[PDB]
Amino acid sequence: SMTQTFSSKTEWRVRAISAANLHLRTNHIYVSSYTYILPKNVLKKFICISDLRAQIAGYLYGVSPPDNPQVKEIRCIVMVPQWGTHQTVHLPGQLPQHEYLKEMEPLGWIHTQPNESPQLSPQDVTTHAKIMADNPSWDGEKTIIITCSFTPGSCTLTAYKLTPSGYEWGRQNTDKGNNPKGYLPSHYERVQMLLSDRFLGFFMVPAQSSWNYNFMGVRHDPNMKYELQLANPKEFYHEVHRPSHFLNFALL
Amino acid sequence: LAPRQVLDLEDLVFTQGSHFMANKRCQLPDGSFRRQRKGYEEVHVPALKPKPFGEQLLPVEKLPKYAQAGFEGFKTLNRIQSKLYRAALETDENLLLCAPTGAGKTNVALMCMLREIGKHINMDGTINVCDFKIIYIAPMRSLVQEMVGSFGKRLATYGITVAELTGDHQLCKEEISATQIIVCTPEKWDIITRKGGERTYTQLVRLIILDEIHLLHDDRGPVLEALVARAIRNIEMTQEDVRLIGLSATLPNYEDVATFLRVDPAKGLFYFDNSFRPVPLEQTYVGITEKKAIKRFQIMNEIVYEKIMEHAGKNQVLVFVHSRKETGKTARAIRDMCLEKDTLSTEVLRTEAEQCKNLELKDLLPYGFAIHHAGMTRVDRTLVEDLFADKHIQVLVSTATLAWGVNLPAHTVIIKGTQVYSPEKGRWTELGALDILQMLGRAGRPQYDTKGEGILITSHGELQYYLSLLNQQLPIESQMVSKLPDMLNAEIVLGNVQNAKDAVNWLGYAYLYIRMLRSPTLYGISHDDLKGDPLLDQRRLDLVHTAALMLDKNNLVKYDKKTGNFQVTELGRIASHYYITNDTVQTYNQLLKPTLSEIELFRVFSLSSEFKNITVREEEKLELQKLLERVPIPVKESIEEPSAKINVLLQAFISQLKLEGFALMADMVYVTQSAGRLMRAIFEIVLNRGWAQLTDKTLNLCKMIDKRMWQSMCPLRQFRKLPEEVVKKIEKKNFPFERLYDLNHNEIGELIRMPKMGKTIHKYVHLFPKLELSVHLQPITRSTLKVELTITPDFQWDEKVHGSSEAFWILVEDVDSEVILHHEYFLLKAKYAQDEHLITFFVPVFEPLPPQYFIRVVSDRWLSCETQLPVSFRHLILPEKYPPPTELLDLQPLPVSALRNSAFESLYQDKFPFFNPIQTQVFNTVYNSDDNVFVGAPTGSGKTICAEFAILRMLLQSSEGRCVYITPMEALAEQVYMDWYEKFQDRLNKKVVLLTGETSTDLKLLGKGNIIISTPEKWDILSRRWKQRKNVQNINLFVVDEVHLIGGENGPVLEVICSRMRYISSQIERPIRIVALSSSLSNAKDVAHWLGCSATSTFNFHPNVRPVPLELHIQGFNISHTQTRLLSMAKPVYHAITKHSPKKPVIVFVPSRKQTRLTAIDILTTCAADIQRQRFLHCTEKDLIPYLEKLSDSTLKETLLNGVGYLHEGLSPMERRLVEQLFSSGAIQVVVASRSLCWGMNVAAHLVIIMDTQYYNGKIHAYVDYPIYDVLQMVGHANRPLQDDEGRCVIMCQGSKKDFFKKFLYEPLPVESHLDHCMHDHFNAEIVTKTIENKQDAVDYLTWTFLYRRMTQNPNYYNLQGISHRHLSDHLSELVEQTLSDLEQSKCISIEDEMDVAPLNLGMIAAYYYINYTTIELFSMSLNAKTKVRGLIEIISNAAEYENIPIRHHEDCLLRQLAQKVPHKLNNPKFNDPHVKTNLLLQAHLSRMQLSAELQSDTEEILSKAIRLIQACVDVLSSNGWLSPALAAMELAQMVTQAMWSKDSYLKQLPHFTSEHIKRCTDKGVESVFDIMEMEDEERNALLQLTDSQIADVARFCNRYPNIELSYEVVDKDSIRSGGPVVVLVQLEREEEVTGPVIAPLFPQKREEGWWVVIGDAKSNSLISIKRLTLQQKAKVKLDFVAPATGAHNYTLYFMSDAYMGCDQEYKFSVD
């Protein structure tokens, strides 16, 4: 007398409906009370192009104001081929390279995460330290980790520095879990971060494709090489980021 | 007035549409009888009989004979056509012809067509394609195509073209210029005339045929009412008639239809009952009573079989089913049970039965069956149509397309059901009336049947209806009350209805209105308040009120119930133009927002009111959830929402899924037919709102809908001509499509791994549209950036894929790619598919300076076809902020007594007692010093008085000094000349002269003139020759006025001459004083520095100091369609007048000649609506009639009588004077002037309104922004220093132009040079004059210019990146090197040793006659030893000087038949090149033809350059030694002067000498001016029947006619020196003292006789000596050449004028 039938409820459909309301969080951005000044225009765009469950990341580039070398103005965010989960974001080993960024210095990276947390993530220390160990252009005293956590109806930002001991731990860490061994809160400090309207930042995106590989993670490996171009990134669920969903009606 | 009730329109609606039955009983013909059967009832109606033939048929031989080709191969008009031919062909009367279907109405329509075709027959060629258009309105699309070929075949002998109207926008306007009869559907013609602002082609409509006009009763009926009311009302407001022809079925209310068509019922109404059917019809109706689901279904098949059995073998039976699916099925079900036994010939069927194969078909033929529907191949039912026509098919089961689109008759017709599924209603409904009549109308073949048999099977409840429809008893009602809001909005958007009064008047033209009068009970009205409102005035006002309120609630219109006024909106216009119901447009208005996902866009589309009847049926949630489950755009709403269903069908249609539900595929078709224009509405809304992200999404959705694919599909799929399947090949190789351009042919065959088609993919890879972009950033200020975008195509054109054009959108987006800072529509035509295109625009910039903008150019039609150029500003050099102005010091105003010269004071003290502050500050420096002075102040500052000061100073120093005054515009010059003629000539006894074209004249004006007024070009031609002319270097004062125009289009000439006067002053070392006046310049110091003005002598005043304070207001207007935008400015113009100057004079500038008349009338209608009628007339209607006795403009006098004037280039010279007079006197309060007149208006106003700031360019077919200089000049008219404490100005612009106007009106103006783009003709002049002798001279020369100074102050603007000293000698050198090589390549200069430049002969001719160096180059190629008077015109027309002769599609036609009348028919005519228009205008001039007044003003500019070009040729032919063509061009100069051909008679030069006069004198023995000059005195007054005043005119010409007897002698003739000198002396002596110039009344400028003296060998075609000669009294001229060897040669002399014909002397002489 039963005869009930399952009909799939693919969850990227539900999450894609949420991403279209992300723009409302850009009216409720909060910053936690060297110095780093984030321009609002690229931050708002970075929020909208993102996802509520899958983390996304972007590299930070900037330059100190003329006579004021103790503050770092963030002038550019670079989106590189990536995929993410709710705990990390898998970047390629190759750091951005472009003529435009040569006049600037690298200031670290900014990523989103689902829930706020009073502590910089352990796999976040591991990420930052492992980048520093492969790229001496990341100073440690000048590169930060700006977290963008999806608090209810909002967006709160926090900027962390790595410590010397946090660096030496993160390089050697292999446990990718959320409570690995030798993890200690003395691996990071907070740093001053300000959101400003006085200048605009700009984006650089990949040249031969886009940045979002979360719907095609197999064609993404840590050794992948990419060029860049002066242009703005596409939203998370844009067509070009999931062509299978469109082309797989040639079977239906 | 006053609407008193808000109706519920939906209650008034006839719900059943054309199935509404107004008649409650239906009477049948006498033989009718009813049966009764098991489950169905049967009504039989017997065939009628013709009625006893009471006039005779018309032999085609008696039709008018211009009309007999339309009836080629025809005998005799049938009965109907014979009753109609006199009304159709011999009168213009509107007609309404009601006849049974196929009674012959279509030939009656040709007869009307043929009468209009006749209106443009001369014997000429034969028909004038250009004067008219004919509109045939047919209900069905299938009907249109048949009629296009049927009418085209019958009229192709008339050379006219009949064409269908494709659904396109801008490609379907091309086909209207070419066709005379346009066949279209009601809705297609409605869409086109809803825009009309194109400068329409619909003004040529002379005839409108409305076929099947009983469509009025259909849901589509209101389209017909909208069309007629618009036409008839347009007849009122233009007074050119349009003939209307209605053809309808024979149904009740036809007389009301005739009232609605304005048909005189006693002249144009013709009703032929169904007894005039071609073949009598035996009718059978079968009304099934079974309400059981599918026992009714097989009862139907039972009735079908029995009826089809009655006709087995005897007659073919066309069975009508109502879906392309039911054709095959019903046709086979019949054949299925006919297996019991059959009744037949057969292998002509079996032969083609699988010669041709096609599923089912002799599964559906055995017993001659067939189907016919729109899904089958063209030929797979072409002569399947015609297996039937050969009587070979026995049963044909078809749909209604065959009835409408193919003339296929059959003895028996069976309409199976009457039920059809209607997606618009989301429901099964009955067929439309047109379909039923059309199908049954196909019963009974023309010849072979004595009766057709029509069988209709339907539900028994519908019998009375179908009985009524087929027996003249279903009345034709109006369905428009529903569509009234939409229709009314269309008339508001057009400006046809501006208030509810207009709308009530408009409504009275509707068919609805007629029906409401005749039958008020049917239409909710009411016998007992009708008679209390007999015109239904209150009723109409109430309906219009209800509609207005609905339109106001949905934000389409702004309606206030007090005024009853309507106000168009952009949303309103979009709803009308995209044919979208207004409820939909409000939904878009509220849901559309820039933050929109593609998820939410798809949802917004699915909520359009066009889909308000769609539902999710239970038997539909099958696929609807299967598809929704995984569809690429998620759908938030549940399956139970019909919005989700529409969403799924749209995406399924794009993915090309094919569904299984029968209604769902039908619903999918309706959804996506609408999507195209609905989605384009959204695109236009969001694009014009600036929403960069949404604009990109919507335009994508348009293209996806159009091409049925997603972006993620390889864009090669779009190559329609593509049967490859080899991109799913490519698509599974996921790699960037942009990468295939890099690579060759074979590697593609390797990436996709199909070797054989590597080349074909490569071919289509580069057929795909691809543009490359480069950008030149040009900073204007620190806040406004000018951008030059160069588009370079990078693909191959191919009309098989691209057609004639490819459309692109250029999009300038900001940093975050979310605001469109600028956008424009770019069209790449196939003629220029291989050229770079230059685009310029302005964008705003701020000084923290954004990292970059972006420039996108995306295909309008091609998916995945876009190029984005990042425009970064990291290296943008901004200019420096402008310095503060010169402070205006609070000096007490200087009195005119400070001139200390009573004579000088006689020029001012009558008018004003004190000079203004600006004049008071500069006075001392100007009057009491010789310093070079710059005065920069707002226009209207009395800047010209300051120059008068310097002239007065000169007159004291020199008493005979020369002053050259330059102003940039010829209208300003002529106004300066009168005011300065009064002052310095009349009241000071100096000489004031105003230069013309003629250098010979102007040279003497420079000697005698104490002050010379000149435009730039006229001084350039003369100042070039300054080393030869003392008069040019002996100039005390040089005044350049309005100098800020160096930055405008004509700046470079003005910049060259000023620098020349600066350079001359250096060479002569006796300085020339320079005074420069200017509008407020931000970079004033650069101008002053360039002209040598000490900083204390540069007065840089900014706008704030204008002596009469200016109140500038800038109103922004949101509508982007300029015609609608103008409409939304109409009333705000009148409101500005009452707000800012309800009493004091107002000038309104409007963009075009046509607009002056319209706005003047508009202002008056609004004035009379204020019931302040004539509030602008301050004199009585009495004082005006002495003025109003010149009505050469009939409408200006109605305007003047109500207080308004208008001014444009078309009014007579003194017409403009009288409007100006009445204006400046105060009698006329308002004058509406065109934009072109803004430079020569002799009046001023308290308030200036600028109505829009763009004008249409006829040449480039695009709207151009007003130059900023013109706007400054218009605003300066709001300045009355004697009468007003203030000047006010309102600028109404497109909102996108507002910020620009505030920036460049309030702040002083920055001006740059554009001489770097104008180098050749001036470098050529300085190499001729030896100022430039080597490439270093060219560099030194550039540094005198204004271009130099600005290079260091704004390098990026001139394409510099550093102001280093070597950077710009590098730059200056490059400019020198490329200008000299071009000049050297074109053979005007020679370059020696990579360094030395010197003039060649061409260069001398070009510089001498002020002729562009490329004009003289084509002269040098084309001119040759043989070409004569004909080819000369051909090569002069091609001059660059005539490149910018305007071309309008209006006279794209008068010249088509002008080439018919010119003596010299022309090489390969193309007809929209200016060079052939100039060719024909020149030929039309020598033949004394009078053209348009527009073609007249066109010609007067052509002739203004002709003499220079003609003389350039004579100078070229002679130095090459060619005798015949040189003399030929010398007589062309006299030809173009007196307007003649050389074959004409010499006496055609005399005044009043006309056609017959010359024959009267050739008859007597006189053929010369000298033969007249003395025949016995009164023996001529009796020979010319002419007025004594006319005789006096003939005498003056004879006395100015040259009377020189030439003396020739040769020096020392005894000397044959075998190759030495041979001087020969010629002396010229006239008898008179030529008091006056050449008398040539048909030449625009005054000339003076120019003479050539030629030595040539007549036999050799060999010119030897040549010299020009101006002559009066004394003249001795010497000619010399080198002798030949032999002692036996004779030459012939030639005395040749360039003005008069018949004075050419000729002596022969052998000088050994």
Curated annotation (Swiss-Prot), chain A:
Outcome recorded upon mutating residue 241 to P: In RP13; no effect on interaction with SNRNP200 and EFTUD2
Outcome (variant: residue 242 to K):
In RP13; reduces interaction with SNRNP200 and EFTUD2
Domain MPN spans what residues? 35-166
Localization: Nucleus; Nucleus speckle
Found in which tissues?
Widely expressed.
Associated disorder is:
Retinitis pigmentosa 13: A retinal dystrophy belonging to the group of pigmentary retinopathies. Retinitis pigmentosa is characterized by retinal pigment deposits visible on fundus examination and primary loss of rod photoreceptor cells followed by secondary loss of cone photoreceptors. Patients typically have night vision blindness and loss of midperipheral visual field. As their condition progresses, they lose their far peripheral visual field and eventually central vision as well.
Query: What does the function comment of this entry state?
Result: Plays a role in pre-mRNA splicing as core component of precatalytic, catalytic and postcatalytic spliceosomal complexes, both of the predominant U2-type spliceosome and the minor U12-type spliceosome. Functions as a scaffold that mediates the ordered assembly of spliceosomal proteins and snRNAs. Required for the assembly of the U4/U6-U5 tri-snRNP complex, a building block of the spliceosome. Functions as a scaffold that positions spliceosomal U2, U5 and U6 snRNAs at splice sites on pre-mRNA substrates, so that splicing can occur. Interacts with both the 5' and the 3' splice site.
Task: Outline the subunit composition.
Answer: Part of the U5 snRNP complex. Component of the U4/U6-U5 tri-snRNP complex composed of the U4, U6 and U5 snRNAs and at least PRPF3, PRPF4, PRPF6, PRPF8, PRPF31, SNRNP200, TXNL4A, SNRNP40, DDX23, CD2BP2, PPIH, SNU13, EFTUD2, SART1 and USP39. Component of the U5.U4atac/U6atac snRNP complexes in U12-dependent spliceosomes. Within the minor spliceosome, which acts on U12-type introns, interacts with PPIL2 and RBM48. Core component of U2-type precatalytic, catalytic and postcatalytic spliceosomal complexes. Found in a mRNA splicing-dependent exon junction complex (EJC) with SRRM1.
Q: What is known of its domains?
A: The MPN (JAB/Mov34) domain mediates interaction with TSSC4 and SNRNP200. Has structural similarity with deubiquitinating enzymes, but lacks the residues that would bind the catalytic metal ion.
Q: What is this protein called?
A: Pre-mRNA-processing-splicing factor 8
Question: Which organism was this protein described from?
Answer: Homo sapiens
Give me the gene this protein comes from. PRPF8
**Part of the full-length chain shown:** 2064 to 2320 of 2335
Curated annotation (Swiss-Prot), chain B:
Q: What is the effect of changing residue 233 to A?
A: Strongly decreases ATP-dependent RNA helicase activity
Q: Which GO terms describe its biological process?
A: cis assembly of pre-catalytic spliceosome; mRNA splicing, via spliceosome; osteoblast differentiation; spliceosome conformational change to release U4 (or U4atac) and U1 (or U11)
- In this UniProt entry, the residues modified to N6-acetyllysine are 558
Q: Where is this motif: DEVH box?
A: 1041-1044
Which compartments does it reside in?
A: Nucleus
Phosphotyrosine modifications at:
305
Q: Which residues carry this modification: Phosphothreonine?
A: 1015, 1352
> Does the record carry Translocase as a key word?
no
Q: What class of enzyme is it?
A: hydrolase
Name of the protein this chain belongs to: U5 small nuclear ribonucleoprotein 200 kDa helicase
Q: Which organism is it from?
A: Homo sapiens
Entire protein: shown range: 403 to 2125 of 2136
